Design a protein around this ligand. Sequence first.
Ligand SMILES: CCCCCCCC/C=C\CCCCCCCC(=O)O[C@@H](COC(=O)CCCCCCCCCCCCCCC)COP(=O)([O-])OCC[N+](C)(C)C
Ligand SMILES: CCCCCCCC/C=C\CCCCCCCC(=O)O[C@@H](COC(=O)CCCCCCCCCCCCCCC)COP(=O)([O-])OCC[N+](C)(C)C
Ligand SMILES: CCCCCCCC/C=C\CCCCCCCC(=O)O[C@@H](COC(=O)CCCCCCCCCCCCCCC)COP(=O)([O-])OCC[N+](C)(C)C
Ligand SMILES: CCCCCCCC/C=C\CCCCCCCC(=O)O[C@@H](COC(=O)CCCCCCCCCCCCCCC)COP(=O)([O-])OCC[N+](C)(C)C
Ligand SMILES: CCCCCCCC/C=C\CCCCCCCC(=O)O[C@@H](COC(=O)CCCCCCCCCCCCCCC)COP(=O)([O-])OCC[N+](C)(C)C
Lengths: 293, 293, 293, 293, 293
Amino acid sequence: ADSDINIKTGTTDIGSNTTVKTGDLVTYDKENGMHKKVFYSFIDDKNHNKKLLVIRTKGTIAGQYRVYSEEGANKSGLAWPSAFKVQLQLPDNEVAQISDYYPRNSIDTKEYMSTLTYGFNGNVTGDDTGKIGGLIGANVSIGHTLKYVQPDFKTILESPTDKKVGWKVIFNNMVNQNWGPYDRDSWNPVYGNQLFMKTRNGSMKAADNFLDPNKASSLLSSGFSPDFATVITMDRKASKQQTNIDVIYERVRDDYQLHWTSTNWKGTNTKDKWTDRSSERYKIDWEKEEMTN
Amino acid sequence: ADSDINIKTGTTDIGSNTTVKTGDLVTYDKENGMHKKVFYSFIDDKNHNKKLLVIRTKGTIAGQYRVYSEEGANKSGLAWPSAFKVQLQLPDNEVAQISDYYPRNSIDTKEYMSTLTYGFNGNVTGDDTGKIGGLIGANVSIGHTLKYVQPDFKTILESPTDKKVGWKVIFNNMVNQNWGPYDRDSWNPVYGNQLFMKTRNGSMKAADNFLDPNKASSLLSSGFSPDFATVITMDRKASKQQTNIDVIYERVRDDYQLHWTSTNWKGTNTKDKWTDRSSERYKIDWEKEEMTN
Amino acid sequence: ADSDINIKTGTTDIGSNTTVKTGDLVTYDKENGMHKKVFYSFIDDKNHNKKLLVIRTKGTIAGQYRVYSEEGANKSGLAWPSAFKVQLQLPDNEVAQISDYYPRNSIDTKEYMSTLTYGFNGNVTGDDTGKIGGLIGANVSIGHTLKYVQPDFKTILESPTDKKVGWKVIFNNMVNQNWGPYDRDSWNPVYGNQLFMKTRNGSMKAADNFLDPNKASSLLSSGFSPDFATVITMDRKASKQQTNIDVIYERVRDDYQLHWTSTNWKGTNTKDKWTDRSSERYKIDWEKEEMTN
Amino acid sequence: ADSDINIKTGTTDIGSNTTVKTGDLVTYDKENGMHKKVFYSFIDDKNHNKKLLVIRTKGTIAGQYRVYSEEGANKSGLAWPSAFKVQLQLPDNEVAQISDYYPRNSIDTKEYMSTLTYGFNGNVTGDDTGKIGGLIGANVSIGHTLKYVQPDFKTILESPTDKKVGWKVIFNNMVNQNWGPYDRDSWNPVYGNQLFMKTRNGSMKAADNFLDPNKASSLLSSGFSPDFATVITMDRKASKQQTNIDVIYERVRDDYQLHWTSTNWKGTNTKDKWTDRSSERYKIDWEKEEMTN
Amino acid sequence: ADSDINIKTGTTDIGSNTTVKTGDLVTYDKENGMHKKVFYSFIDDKNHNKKLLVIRTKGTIAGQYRVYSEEGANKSGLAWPSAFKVQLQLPDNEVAQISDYYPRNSIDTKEYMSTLTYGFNGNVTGDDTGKIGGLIGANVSIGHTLKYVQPDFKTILESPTDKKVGWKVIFNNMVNQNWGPYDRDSWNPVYGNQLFMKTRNGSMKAADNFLDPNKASSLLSSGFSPDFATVITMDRKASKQQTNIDVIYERVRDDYQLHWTSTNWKGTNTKDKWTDRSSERYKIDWEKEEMTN
Ligand SMILES: CCCCCCCC/C=C\CCCCCCCC(=O)O[C@@H](COC(=O)CCCCCCCCCCCCCCC)COP(=O)([O-])OCC[N+](C)(C)C
Ligand SMILES: CCCCCCCC/C=C\CCCCCCCC(=O)O[C@@H](COC(=O)CCCCCCCCCCCCCCC)COP(=O)([O-])OCC[N+](C)(C)C
Ligand SMILES: CCCCCCCC/C=C\CCCCCCCC(=O)O[C@@H](COC(=O)CCCCCCCCCCCCCCC)COP(=O)([O-])OCC[N+](C)(C)C
Ligand SMILES: CCCCCCCC/C=C\CCCCCCCC(=O)O[C@@H](COC(=O)CCCCCCCCCCCCCCC)COP(=O)([O-])OCC[N+](C)(C)C
Ligand SMILES: CCCCCCCC/C=C\CCCCCCCC(=O)O[C@@H](COC(=O)CCCCCCCCCCCCCCC)COP(=O)([O-])OCC[N+](C)(C)C
């Protein structure tokens, strides 16, 4: 906090008394259904040291959650997005550099609780025949309790090198039919991986026996809208004022297959089955303060 | 709070009615993968007593979480970052001084709860043969409950001397596979240190039997992005207006080795195995209000 | 709240339409490792009655947590900071006076909860031979639950007299290895004071058997950064416009010794073993609105 | 809330477009250790109807927590502050009046919870000899739970008459050694009042066997800093423009004595033992807008 | 929320670009100890339709909690305030009207929770003689939990007619000596109403055996400070510009009597015993924008 140093709040910020020429570019890849978008802003403050440029790759990525193949009632498949990714890269011989990026890895906290209990007991037993009995007892108990919050999808920031920076979204785990949370590597010897399982021993058709997309998480079927911000700085005395950028919106799917062995349904997961990449190259003109492509 | 003294809020702050010449420097160490960055700001308020300069060493440090060595299925190793560090130092004969630093040690709180319970009981027992029995009893219980929040990574501020100040990030403990939180010194006589253990008695290959990086904390594999702020003040009447600074982004790793003894997997940890340091020297020109290197 | 009286917020504050000449002084005591700092601000509002001056003794104090003496494996010592202190004093014959101070003693609250429970029970017992039995019973229970938050270090404000004001930080208690919170006066007949105890009956060397500094609280090893604010007012018609101030950053340590009696480790604490004081005298010139020393 | 009536926020406030001549007075009573302070502010808005004056009696009161008398090991005494008080009074024949006061009595809330439980049970018992037995039972339970927050010190506002207004701080109850909260009237037939008791049956000296001041609440030993605000209004056409005020900072202590009867320590409390009052008379000049004394 | 309609926040408010002539009136009724106060404000916005006037009857009402009569040790009485009231009324033939009032009745919410539990059990019993026994059982449980917050004093708004509007404060219930909350109609066949009962079977004098005022709620003994706001609007073309207002601060007490029957103390409550009213008539001059009386 800039105010915790006695520095007046906002003194160290940049962007005062300057005109920023923003813009927008929208392009849709019908083949992959990735409504990618970039929102940039040229900031050139005379009090600064280098020209600035912030790229907000808002865009949007489809879910692609459907049964790709069905083979009778014996077995059927299913493809779902395991992880979403978006990254920005620059030419190796280029002069511009990546400075900052808002969504970054953050430390996680977990609660903890220890319980210690003492106890005592004593009773008198008697009956019609006049027998009298006694009982004295005691007990101790110790208990450790740990709780934490684990989101279904956990955003991560891949190691940002100078020339390229890339984010990532993965599938931590999901809760199905109010049962214990499952994940890709969850296994059960009898049923197997029950992540996307409708009924344990249903008699319906193989393809029909799948978890409803509405019940599952919104990202899987309805897509995930990203919001990542990066800032690019380039020296104001550079001989060449043209820069090239590349934007990637790759998405990784998985294969989920149900198998009827003799009585119950069995499920198996094949992580990293298909990968779809949609890369477009943009051009930057620092002199004209415009990104067009 | 400046407002709790009846002083109008922000009156004691510095930076009003002045022009601040900010800047930026970005350099990447491919050898160590440390995308270090410094964001400075020259504040020279005539109402102040000394020139000011705030260095925000945002930067970023890679994770370097991989199996460095594998030796068949008998055993395999693993290297992970135990602690991240970043510090700023000045020449001993220099005249500038360190004034403040935002992230600082903070007191920690823990809950507490004491429980006391009384009880009474009485029942009548009878059967077909007409036997009637009685029972009177009582019990007491006392319970102490203590809970607190312990983050996986706990930031610390090393003893800040005048010439140098240094922060630190360490590995408090981690939760594995929803089991009890482990740490570097955790030991189990049968299995041993089970921090990064995939399966207790899995039959897979030695190298494969490791916790997935996605399951583990984000910092270990995807790196840690620091945000530390320091302010440097130098007298306005100093004969020499040039100052030299040094920035360090050292990172410490550890060695984790799994051993198959006869049936189960055994794990051992060797703290402070390797250390990587990447120091760069910057130059400060108070007269020109610019940091270049 | 000034707004709860219908007075417009901030009307009663002081510091409007005036120029404040702030400053800074930094000095480091290598002998004691106390990076003391003072940040002042001269406020002289014509609408006010007396000149004002606020001293923010931010500074910083080292931890000094190390094993001072080791004597073989039989026993070893340990010195840790029991309490931190910082206070401001004025000459007895001086004319300036202490007005206010932000961090002040605050009331503490504790939860409370009373539970009352009734119960009834009735069962029928029968067997193969046709015997039928009955049982009717009842029970009552009363329970008192009390929980509160107790920080490890509890800041206190010593009785502020006109000429001097002094704060204080003490060691309330600590939680070790997720066990019951201990404190200086905690005693156990078998083991003794187990505050800084690594293992109850470890076979390692005497000096090695100590709690890791990382596990313990951050203040003990990495130091404590204070932030206390005071305001000094002096009459504007005083004949002499020069004032002298004294700043103290005294820190108190303790001695902790482990003793191996026959099988287990025994620990004893000797409170108030050593005291370190580092006092520097500053000079105030109200006429020139500057503090220099 | 002025905004809940559709009136623009702050429209009804007073203090706009006016100059307020604030001030300060500091005086210390070494005899009683009461660093009393008054911070006033003259508000005279032409749009208003009467002149205004707000007195903020911040000040500070010492704790005075020490063993006043010790008589061997048989018994010893102890004096602690039972209640703090501060009030403002005006001459009976005066014309000024008390209008408002910020800290005022507030309603208190308490939680509540009712629990109802049904239960059923049935088991089959069998042994090697083939005997088969059954058991069917049921139970009901009702539970009332009530919890609330009770601070150690509870501020109160004495009945404010026109000429004088007075606040009050009392000792609600305290928690000792993590045991049940005690208070002045708490009594135990065996031990007695165990409020400030160190050990139930300790063998140390009578004077030494007292609760450490650090463990007890901060107010008792380190003093209590008050913050009460009052506003005084006087007609602008009054013939006499001079007004006299009186400020009181009375503090009430108590006597606590431990008695060793035969084996254990016994404690008794004598409420309202001593009272200390420190009254100073200030003078107000509405015409000159200044309070001096 | 005016901003939820897309209307810019504060557009519909009234009071912009206008001068408000506020005021104040203070009068104390020594007979009843009711430090009544009214704070008004004349708002006349040309963009408005009618003249406005807001009356904030802050004032303050004493508690009057004392033992009115004592008759030996056999029995004694006690008078406490059951309910506080404040209302504003206008002449029937008057033309002004009541528009709004801030403190208004609000809906109350209560939590709810349903619990369902299944259970199974099975054990094997064996002894030295080789007898082996078994036991299999199961159980079910259902539980409804409801909790809510009930303040001791619950403010209410009486049916506001055009000519008069009146608020009300009543005594919902109180918690005594950490026991179940009692109220006026609470009855116990053995002891009776135990609201203000010190000891169930104490041997002290009848008058002394009362709950300490400090333990009870602050309002009962130390008084209640009200804060109610009303706005009065009168047409700008009215022939007569003078209006009369009446302010009432009536307070209702109760009689509480303890009776020693043979062994224990018995308590009875007589609701609505005495009523005190203190009405003063104010005069309003819209033309001069002043309220004087
Ligand atoms: C290693 C040594 C061996 C163990 C020694 C003793 C244990 C076994 C004894 C033997 C079993 C006998 C049981 C009797 C009572 C048990 C509680 C007790 O002993 O003290 C308790 C005090 O906690 C309290 O607050 C007191 C409990 C009742 C309070 C009643 C107050 C007034 C009574 C009138 C009521 C009406 C009015 C109510 C108020 C208005 C707890 O203390 P402790 O138990 O000594 O705790 C240390 C020991 N331990 C950790 C191992 C458990
Ligand atoms: C050291 C001295 C020895 C112990 C003495 C006594 C204990 C053993 C006795 C012997 C065992 C006999 C058990 C009988 C009852 C037990 C509760 C009791 O005694 O009083 C309880 C009062 O708490 C209440 O609120 C009353 C409980 C029922 C309320 C019913 C209200 C109206 C009844 C109609 C219902 C329908 C309508 C319901 C309402 C609309 C608790 O008080 P205590 O228990 O005296 O607590 C101090 C003692 N102790 C700390 C050691 C526990
Ligand atoms: C000092 C006097 C002696 C004690 C007198 C009685 C106790 C011992 C009796 C004897 C033991 C016999 C036990 C029978 C029931 C116990 C509960 C009971 O009595 O009333 C309870 C009412 O609470 C309820 O809400 C009712 C409980 C069941 C509700 C069923 C609703 C419809 C039934 C169809 C279900 C299907 C559909 C469900 C709905 C859709 C509680 O009231 P109480 O218990 O009278 O409380 C005062 C007494 N006490 C404080 C001392 C405990
Ligand atoms: C005054 C009248 C006398 C009392 C009448 C009955 C009580 C004693 C009877 C006699 C004792 C016999 C016990 C049998 C069951 C007890 C529960 C029951 O009766 O109904 C419960 C329904 O609550 C539920 O939700 C149903 C419980 C099981 C659900 C199973 C679903 C599918 C089964 C397949 C499982 C696998 C798959 C699971 C799902 C995927 C509760 O209703 P109630 O108990 O009627 O409540 C009113 C009565 N009472 C208030 C007095 C309690
Ligand atoms: C109306 C019909 C009659 C009732 C039919 C059955 C009840 C009585 C049966 C008869 C009693 C026999 C008891 C056996 C088990 C009871 C639980 C059970 O049946 O299934 C449970 C599944 O919940 C789970 O998640 C499974 C429980 C254990 C998981 C173990 C995982 C791997 C095993 C290795 C462990 C090591 C590694 C662990 C993992 C790494 C609950 O399902 P349900 O009970 O069928 O619920 C519906 C029925 N009911 C509502 C009426 C209750």
